[PDB]
Design a protein around this ligand. Structure first.
Ligand SMILES: *[C@@H]1O[C@H](CO)[C@@H](O[C@@H]2O[C@H](CO)[C@@H](O)[C@H](O)[C@H]2NC(C)=O)[C@H](O)[C@H]1NC(C)=O
Ligand code: CUO
Ligand code: CUO
Lengths: 118, 736, 366
């Protein structure tokens, strides 16, 4: 049944936000906002673990998080992601552990990933 | 199957067909070499080997001449393939100015790389087996004369074929086609009874097929001209003659053993050579001109009042050279020489039309008008001449053709063709050098420094305010291919604006290199008059901000490969071409491109070793023209692989955002297209939007189709890979 | 496939839209025509099912029928045509639109006449590829149809299975959204053929066999009670050949990976090798059943049919290549063989015997 629901999902057109992550020598929480008209919505969130004493790490690839349903709420069709005429942009408010503080953006910007169905 | 230029062949390709030819030739059977060399002429197998009256089989002086020889060339091709050559029968341009025969068929011997033994070159000689004397083919005597005197404005062979491509009707094209081709036969043959002077034994000499691979390609060129011209390309002028079964090929299983050629012994379906015969050519470029470029030249040609000397050429048994003289007063003038190819047992032949020979510039240099009183003198000399009476051939007549066309304007006002700087003519070289000076001469916005300055620290990112600065050249590197697509376009367009009719050339570094192209290495060059150094393709270029010349000192390499494997760059690009989605390609794509930047970029920081100063050396234009070419090869591969080519689905963030420096209109850059097509999504489709096509998309001798097989053959291997996670550092670093 | 959201997105709503017009049909009237509720009358006015399969004018009726259906999404954001799925291309599973359980208009239909939504029971190189390609091979239209209809209904057999309310049955098939979509494809196949002919200079917007029958008008499309002007206009046979005045377009008439010209080469290429076929006579029977071949397995093919359907008999034989079978037994069309068959009803039983007579067995070089 698990693989049944999984195969089901790959049969839908999906949109992701790609995050290259690495040790910033401190833990932090990464909030994702995609802004259409400079109107912003809380789309999703990422957490990062780390410490003063840390083993420096860089991910081999980027973690994905699907904005697929979030886009459906804003009624901006997946097709408009390709259109320069239509206005959409991606923004992240990186916020540290102690609060706020907040970190100036030390994490590379997210990318839109369109995964067409099979 | 790919038929290439003889010069374009790598030593691998050169050796592999040498062994194939060697095997095909060495050992004699009905499926062997001799049996095929005997198809064309003199064992006299037509109409039948039986009985009393027999003449040479090959068709000449008829509209089916090219059809016939297309089959023979195909026979030779299949025979070589079957014996282990990956390549179709190669061709050599005689249209290219040449002093002597190419090394492939010139050398008596060659060294075997594996055995390290020097054995006979199969293409220099060839035995003649049906006689019992032997050997005895000998192309050794070359007639008068290779570079001059014959015609020419210029190149004997080039002019005649230009005129041939000009004609609308098939037969009109065919006469000029064949009789021009006839010359190089008699020219290379000489006084020798064998080896291409005589119709009888011409096909025994191995040059014959390399020769007619070219001839065939020329027809293919004319055919593509006609579809662009929008007119019928089949042989309707001689419709009945297409249904006559090609004489030696149509024969039954003992006499001819090739399936493909026997099915097509009726040439009606021979026209579509790619479908029916399963081969093609590396380029259909004639001279330096593309096919669209080719129709232009004949228009400039067809706009003049021209006068011709027309010859009706019918079969006289011997093969003969006639020298044409224009005599308008007292002494006469040599206007040229044409050759008629034949033999004692030749199949009786006669042209329906007349062969037109240009004689237009004979008149001018004689101080004589078109309509002044003049005779034509011919002296007919046999190749074994023993010169012939002038009556052997019916007297020439002069034909007058008034200027004609208004086919302008033309949709290729925007169209360009990018070729190799290693392949350029001295005439084309000077044309590029002068054009670039004016490009360099302009120091502000419409000039060369500005487009080079987009690699500079000038701050357009962000704006109007930007609080802290960095260079605005696109890297990162997802959109790297797109931006340089536009940079190389700006470099091109600005260079076109300054008196040039061509597109921005490139150089193949996938292939091995001895030194930089002739266009770049030298500080000083000689114009037609003779000139001091402009240059302006030496690294010398003033950066207004830095106030210096961007000097480029070479490095210790670059020539590593042995017989077995490709150059390191070729290996890299293959791995880059492998990838399915765009980004996985892009990473490999450019990391490979970073090489030369660091290779011609020596110790000196003013060189293109640094991406800040990089673009001020003009080789950058050549580099990222070729870099852009690879990106285009890929796009064709993606189409071949049935996957997205003029779009992509990764890194949409940067792919939908207009470039920083190109999107800042209108004060900052003059280009209409880079302004309109600044979004990476728009710059994907280079064919429709930027109106330029490349020379070839072939990579290191491998066509796109072969490339995919090679890409697939490698993927069958069980292989390990080491991966590198790369971040941007200010230094320009070599990492081993 | 190749759809881009929201291209998918617009449609469900449209299909949703007509689920009840429900006045014109709104959709149930549009459903009845292939479906169970009685379309027409013999002059005695007895119930007939106005289904126009089993005859040579088979495509027009449907190809239209899509139209009627197709029009029905009219200006309801019927922004593109009914899609087609190329069942020819081998497929591990069914296609989404008609799978997604939740909030999907393609899952099922309802039936006022039965109080139920449709039920479907799917049952287990590509078989259909081989089967369709043959149809394309043919040049006579009539010759083509027999294979074209039989290749077709093979899917109404397998999509539906053993539910009366389903695609396997004539009665309620038309009710399931899956049915049109299968069609676009069937129609597309026909179109490809036309392009083929045209390529070959044979008639494509015409057809010489039989002159009889293309002229008979088609109900319901005939009927006064069809409040779409267009279909009535082409209610005829001979009109409806040129689908151009419909007016629709398929994205591309290319069979998978083939130019039409490419396609003929293919077929021409296939044609080299001499083949061996079996041809059956098939004729009306009330039930719908599948038939399984034997000599090793030679099977198989299916026939579509229901109670109160107009009876029909094909003019020509239906051919099914069995050469792979012979190689399987190593026979040479020379050694002589018994062609054994079986014929199951769609309901669980019961493989009753012919019914169909005997299969002829014929050889084609080569
Ligand atoms: C070289 O050419 C001359 C000129 O034709 C040849 O002489 C002719 O030969 C044919 C037979 O092949 C005779 O029928 C003609 O009457 C000859 N004409 C003349 C003017 O000689 C001559 O045979 C050739 N020489 C060689 C060595 O082949
Ligand atoms: O043509 Cu037969 O000789 Cu080159
Ligand atoms: O261009 Cu930015 O460097 Cu190759």
């Amino acid at each position: 049944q698990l693989e049944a629901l999984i195969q089901k999902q790959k049969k839908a057109d999906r949109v992701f936000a790609g995050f290259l992550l690495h040790g910033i020598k401190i833990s932090a929480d990464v909030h994702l906002k995609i802004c259409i008209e400079a109107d912003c919505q809380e789309a999703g969130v990422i957490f990062v673990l780390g410490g003063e004493t840390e083993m420096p790490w860089h991910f081999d690839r980027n973690y994905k998080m699907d904005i697929t349903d979030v886009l459906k709420k804003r009624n901006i069709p997946p097709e408009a992601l390709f259109e320069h005429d239509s206005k959409i942009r991606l923004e992240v408010e990186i916020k540290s552990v102690d609060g706020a503080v907040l970190d100036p953006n030390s994490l590379p910007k997210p990318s839109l990933i369109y995964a067409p169905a099979k | 199957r790919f038929r290439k230029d003889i010069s374009s062949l790598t030593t691998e390709e050169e050796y592999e067909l040498r062994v194939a030819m060697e095997r095909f030739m060495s050992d004699k059977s009905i499926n062997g070499y001799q049996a095929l060399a005997e198809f064309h002429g003199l064992p006299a197998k037509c109409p039948r080997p039986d009985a009393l009256n027999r003449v040479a089989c090959c068709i000449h002086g008829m509209a089916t001449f090219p059809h016939w020889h297309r089959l023979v060339v195909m026979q030779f091709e299949n025979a070589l393939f079957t014996r282990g050559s990956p390549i179709g029968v190669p061709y050599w341009d005689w249209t290219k100015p040449f002093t002597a025969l190419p090394s492939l068929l010139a050398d008596e011997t060659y060294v075997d790389p594996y055995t390290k033994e020097t054995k006979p070159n199969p293409f220099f000689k060839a035995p003649i087996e049906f006689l019992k004397a032997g050997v005895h083919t000998s192309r050794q005597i070359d007639e008068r004369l290779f570079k001059q005197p014959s015609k020419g404005d210029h190149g004997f062979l080039y002019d005649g074929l230009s005129l041939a491509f000009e004609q609308d009707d098939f037969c009109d094209f065919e006469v000029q086609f064949e009789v021009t081709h006839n010359s190089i036969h008699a020219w290379t043959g000489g006084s020798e009874p064998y080896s291409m002077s005589s119709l009888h034994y011409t096909s025994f000499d191995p040059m014959f097929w390399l020769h007619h691979s070219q001839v065939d390609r020329l027809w293919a060129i004319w055919q593509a001209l006609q579809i662009q011209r929008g007119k019928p390309y089949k042989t309707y002028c001689a419709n009945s003659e297409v249904y006559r079964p090609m004489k030696p090929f149509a024969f039954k299983s003992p006499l001819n053993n090739d399936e493909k050629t026997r099915e097509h012994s009726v040439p009606t379906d021979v026209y579509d050579y790619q479908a029916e015969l399963a081969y093609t050519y590396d380029t259909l470029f004639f001279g330096g001109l593309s096919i669209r470029e080719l129709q232009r030249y004949v228009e400039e040609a067809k706009s003049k009042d021209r006068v011709f000397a027309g010859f009706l050429l019918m079969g006289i048994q011997t093969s003969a050279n006639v020298d044409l003289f224009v005599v308008a007063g007292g002494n006469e003038f040599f206007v040229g020489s044409i050759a008629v190819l034949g033999g004692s047992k030749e199949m009786t032949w006669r042209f329906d039309r007349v062969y037109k020979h240009e004689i237009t510039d004979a008149l001018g240099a004689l101080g004589v008008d078109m309509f002044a009183e003049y005779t034509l003198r011919v002296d007919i000399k046999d190749v074994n001449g023993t010169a012939l009476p002038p009556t052997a051939i019916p007297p020439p007549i002069v034909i007058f053709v008034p200027g004609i066309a208004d086919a302008n304007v033309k949709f290729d006002e925007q169209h360009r063709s990018r070729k190799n700087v290693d392949s350029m003519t001295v005439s084309e070289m000077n044309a590029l050098r002068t054009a670039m000076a004016a490009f360099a001469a302009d120091k502000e916005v419409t000039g060369y420094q500005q487009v080079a300055a987009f690699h500079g620290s000038t701050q357009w990112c962000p704006s109007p305010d930007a609080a802290q600065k960095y260079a605005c050249c696109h890297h990162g590197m997802a959109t790297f291919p797109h931006w340089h697509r536009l940079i190389a376009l700006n470099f091109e367009n600005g260079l076109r604006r300054n008196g040039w009719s061509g597109g921005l050339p490139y150089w193949d570094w996938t292939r091995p290199i001895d030194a930089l192209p002739a266009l770049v290495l030298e500080a000083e060059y000689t114009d037609a008059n003779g000139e001091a150094k402009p240059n302006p393709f030496f690294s010398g270029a003033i950066d207004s901000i830095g106030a210096s010349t961007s000097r480029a000192p070479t490095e210790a390499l670059y020539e590593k490969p042995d017989f077995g494997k490709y150059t390191h760059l070729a290996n890299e690009i293959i791995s880059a071409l492998e990838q399915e989605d765009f980004c996985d390609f892009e990473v490999q794509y450019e990391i490979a491109h970073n090489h030369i930047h660091a290779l011609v970029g020596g110790t000196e920081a003013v060189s293109m070793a640094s991406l800040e100063y990089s673009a001020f050396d003009p080789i950058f234009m050549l580099h990222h023209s070729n870099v852009d070419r690879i990106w285009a090869t890929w796009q064709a591969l993606q189409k071949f692989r049935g996957k997205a080519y003029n779009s992509a689905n990764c890194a949409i963030e940067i792919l939908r955002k207009p470039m920083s420096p190109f999107s800042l209109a209108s004060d900052i850059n003059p280009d209409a297209m880079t302004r309109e097509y600044s979004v990476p999504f728009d710059v994907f489709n280079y064919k429709k939007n930027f109106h330029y096509e490349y020379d070839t998309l072939e990579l290191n001798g491998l066509s796109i189709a072969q490339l995919s097989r090679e890409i697939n053959r490698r993927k069958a291997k069980n292989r390990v890979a080491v991966t590198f996670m790369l971040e941007g550092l200010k230094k320009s670093l070599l990492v081993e | 496939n190749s759809l881009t959201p929201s291209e998918i997105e617009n449609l469900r709503n449209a299909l949703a839209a007509v689920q009840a017009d429900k006045t014109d049909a709104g959709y149930q009237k549009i459903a009845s025509f292939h479906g169970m509720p009685l379309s027409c009358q013999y002059p005695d006015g007895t119930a007939f099912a106005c289904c126009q399969h089993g005859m040579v004018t088979f495509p027009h009726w449907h190809r239209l029928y899509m139209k009627q259906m197709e029009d029905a999404l009219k200006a309801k954001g019927a922004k593109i045509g009914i899609p087609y799925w190329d069942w020819t291309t081998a497929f591990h599973s069914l296609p989404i639109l008609v799978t997604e359980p939740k909030n999907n208009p393609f899952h099922h239909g309802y039936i006022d006449v039965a109080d139920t939504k449709t039920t479907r029971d799917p049952r287990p190189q590509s078989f259909f590829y081989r089967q369709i390609a043959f149809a394309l091979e043919q040049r006579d239209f009539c010759d083509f149809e027999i294979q074209f209809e039989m290749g077709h209904n093979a899917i109404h057999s397998w999509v539906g299975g053993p539910s009366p309310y389903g695609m396997s049955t004539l009665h309620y098939t038309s009710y399931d959204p899956l049915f049109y979509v299968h069609h676009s494809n069937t129609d597309r196949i026909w179109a490809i053929w036309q392009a083929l002919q045209k390529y070959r200079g044979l008639p494509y917007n015409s057809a010489n066999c039989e002159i009889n029958k293309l002229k008979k008008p088609m109900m319901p499309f005939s009927s006064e009670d069809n409040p779409n002007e267009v279909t009535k206009a082409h209610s005829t046979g001979y009109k409806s050949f040129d689908y151009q005045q419909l007016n629709y377009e398929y994205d591309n008439l290319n069979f998978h990976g083939m130019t039409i010209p490419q396609l003929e080469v293919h077929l021409k290429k296939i044609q080299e090798k001499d083949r061996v076929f079996a041809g059956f006579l098939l004729r009306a029977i009330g039930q719908s059943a599948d038939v399984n071949f034997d000599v090793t397995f030679g099977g198989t093919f299916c026939v579509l049919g229901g109670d109160y359907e107009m009876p029909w008999a094909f003019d020509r034989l239906f051919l099914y290549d069995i050469s792979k079978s012979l190689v399987h037994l190593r026979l040479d069309a020379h050694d002589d063989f018994d062609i054994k068959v079986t014929i199951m009803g769609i309901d669980g039983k019961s493989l009753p015997p012919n019914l169909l007579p005997s299969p002829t067995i014929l050889f084609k070089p080569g």
